[model samples]
Target chain A: EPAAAPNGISLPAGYKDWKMIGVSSRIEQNNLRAILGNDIAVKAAREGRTHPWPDGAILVKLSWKKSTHELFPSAEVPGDFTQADFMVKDAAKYASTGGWGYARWLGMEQKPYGANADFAQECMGCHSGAKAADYVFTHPAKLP
Target chain B: EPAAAPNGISLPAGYKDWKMIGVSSRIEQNNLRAILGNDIAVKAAREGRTHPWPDGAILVKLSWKKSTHELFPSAEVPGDFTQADFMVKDAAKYASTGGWGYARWLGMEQKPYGANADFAQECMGCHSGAKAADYVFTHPAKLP
Candidate 1:
């Protein structure tokens, strides 16, 4: 069974196959990540309609630790899978929380982050930095 | 002008923004990579219609060398950009070459791979291993 965050959000079904929005290696987080978006989110990003992303937009960031490939000494590949964080947009349901719902699953087991819904407060704290971008940190890569 | 592989196929414009198909860290290649596809390919993969893929389908594999992050000792991230390999499916145009055209670009500059069109034969040689999958190595991830 999938675990749900204290806020009642669960790991999205089959999110492993979502489309790519962009990738980054956060110096502060010490991890490399790829952000993926669902269809609704993909459409918004591609159309540049993301100043305030529409409701139903969901983004998941998958991260991993870096490790060297044995045979390919110079090659660095994802070593240990670390965590997956999710952001779901709902203008009404989450109106008090920047129009977005936050949840995090830690490590490969994907244990939900935090013991209670209050974890959302922590998520919002960091996301406040991207308030200008609708509280989202990802910049969807421009594609044709 | 963008360089063309010996096969006369240039890197597709704005390929950096294509959606993800899947990722792998190949021990044999000693590198980490993410394979992305254009809309045509993405649709086919999502529908499980990739046995033969489809005409106009284009897939690109972006690879990088692994390196440790300066700030995050435990995290490994993509290091030196290595190469980009492209596979284009055109039953009519590429019928003689397994119904697919092959090309590669190397390094950050994305220099065209090979000195001449014959380099395609080299690509075909390796791709033959996946003849069961229409000579393509990537397995489109299953998505909802």
Candidate 2:
């Protein structure tokens, strides 16, 4: 029975329309950030509430693999799909490690990359450095 | 603004057991089976990717109206209900009202709801060629 499976509802609905809050690339990973967020989330970051974002706040990062750039051959040109990372806030539901449920879908198949819930350990390990920001790195894009 | 019209995504609330790709609800109709690849869809249809889906791929057009059921109690024991007349799949065979299908519902109003044909219009209207795999949604993906 296809009754129980993860990534079913958490696949980021309407997330594409979310604002591109940040963008950057990595030489090692060879992918660029397509960070997206809703008004509520961006606003929270702007007001400096990132440490403990509000409920229903979701942030998704779509990483497009860098291919070839025109003149800037070494520049990061968009390539095939690479990664999809999500950070959802449900407070107590994920309070154990700075209150976040992390999901990472990698490669063309868009399958889960890590083994199991233990994957969160890797997520927190990285984001943990942003202690003041509540385990977040990107500051919301300031809106006028 | 939220999309004005239902986007054809009818994933019902709490309709887990499915990774919903897109969902739109109508004060009238619904279903959300987009995200699930053919891999999962196979389980939904039950018997793998058999062209003519076995007994599992059922064509339905159930209807519901104001009525009562023994389950709902005396003011309800064996009462009145509704159905679309669609209970199974047919090569455009079953017909009642041009735009209707069929279903086997015994939720009080313990009546046969009769046969309907037109019910297929609105549905087959969009999902006409669907018989290629029975009048059902996308089948499961084959992992070759």
Candidate 3:
């Protein structure tokens, strides 16, 4: 038998639409600043080169409609943001052009524009092959 | 900002105490005979002397209490039963006697039982390994 569902009533009845928002441009800068520090952000800005946004950034939101069987069942789903945004750095134009893509929670890629797919399956499939750091190309940033 | 709660909801309330019943035991020859054909049952009856269950058997049951949230919640609790009996060939009797424990789901003999502190930690640890399988020894059985 399946374990009993947690008690208390607080979820919406049936399925509900969840929302996601993307801020690739801002997050790319944020992540860059986080890794390279203000010096790198200023240097990149001064060099007149747009540091390509890293790939695979995302952010998502989730909420559901309440049903008659529950009270406060429609409250914000008690979980983390359901989406994420990723930065896709341009490999071909690493020296110039600085091409990149920013993805919102919907997993939509915005670069040349209008390309969305299952990033988890498509992107991670390749990123997982990174020989260094599990194929992911990013550094953890310490708070200032 | 957090997403809006579904319409017609107030506060969030969590779930309460929910427990399920579990059973463990051995399958006797008689029981085997009732399920398997008479010939198979006879072989099982002499299991101790001939092979297999001759040393004994093990079985378990799982059950759950009815949901209290239901409008007509019943006082009666319903339950289900399951078995985990395995046949022991003579060649492996020495290891079985040596306390070599069997794998929970993989159906393999690996660790020695008494060598480990807390048999539950050693056995149940792996028995509870697979979240998808409901933490038990599971084999395909004919539906009742």
Candidate 4:
């Protein structure tokens, strides 16, 4: 079936092949994040491109609630899949949000987190702190 | 088309489908390390295995010469086809170095890095620091 929203984007299929930008516990959000991106997105970040990253680059974040592992004591793995956040780059498409489209899919049903809400701005606002980072946090960590 | 060495390794394929443990510039070595491993190995490391890891785990480290891109001055992409390193797990066969056998194929010639050398011990010694991680570095990084 169609994996994306009726709007025009898919969740960037088979994200496992994506280059991991970084892995970290977003304790502020109570989630563990394994952030990933496509080639140019990684390169732009790695090269310290403060300008808006080129369009067509995609970044995905697979997040899960922080929790202890069932089989292993004192270990942390994603518990509840908190969400899969997506930032698709497209200059014209997401002109309003620093030339990057924002998306978030939450839970097993893959409920759209901020499909048509003001939450889109919320997403951009959080990343604005890294305006110097071209709207990315994990990017710097993975950069050379 | 052949992936294996005559030394009984199957050259565990489809590692691109495996999750990335991490990527490194390895600047001193002039190579980039894109390390990947199957979930079993990742789990064992995350679980803090003081004992030997289970067999059937395969880890692949794909490396390439770090070079500036021809078109994009700021971009760094894989230059020469550097090498592909393989580590196959087998308790009885590799008990010498904590139950993991090592092999590396280098360059376009697909020459063996140390086909018959006891370089497996070389790989093992650096990894022994991760003794609690079943002789792998990023294994511990992935741990809780």
Interface RMSD of each: 6.6, 22.3, 25.5, 10.7
Model 3 lDDT, full chain set: 0.22
Q: Which stretches of model 2 miss by more than 4 angstroms?
A: A1-9, A71-75, A142-144, B1-144
After TM-score superposition, what is the CA distance of residue A15 in candidate 4 from its true location, in Å?
1.2
Kindly list the per-residue Cα lDDT of model 1 for residues B25-143, writing each as its tens digit.
Answer: 65465455777888898778768777898999999887766554443344345666788889999988888789999988888676788867788888888678778889876655333
Write model 3 residue lDDT over B1-95, tens digit each, in one string. Answer: 11112221111111001010111111121111001112232333333222223232222211122112121122111121122222222224424
Clashes of each: 3, 35, 32, 0
What are the chain A TM-scores of the candidates, in order? 0.93, 0.81, 0.21, 0.81
Q: Could you arrange the candidates by lDDT from highest to lowest?
A: 1, 4, 2, 3
The 10-residue segment of model 4 chain B with minimum total lDDT is B135-144
The local lDDT score (0 to 100) that residue B24 gets in candidate 3 is 13
**Candidate 4's residue-wise lDDT over A15-97, tens digit each?**
65566555545435655556678877777666766477888888887766655433333344455666778888898987888
Summing lDDT over every window of 10 consecutive residues in candidate 3 chain B, give the lowest-scoring window: B14-23
Candidate with best TM-score: 1
DockQ of candidate 4 is 0.08
Order the candidates by DockQ, highest first: 1, 4, 2, 3
Native contacts kept, each candidate: 0.11, 0.00, 0.00, 0.04
**Which candidate should be chosen as best, given DockQ against the real structure?**
1
Error of 4 at B59 (Å): 3.8
TM-score on alpha carbons, each prediction? 0.64, 0.45, 0.16, 0.56
DockQ of the candidate models in sequence: 0.16, 0.01, 0.01, 0.08
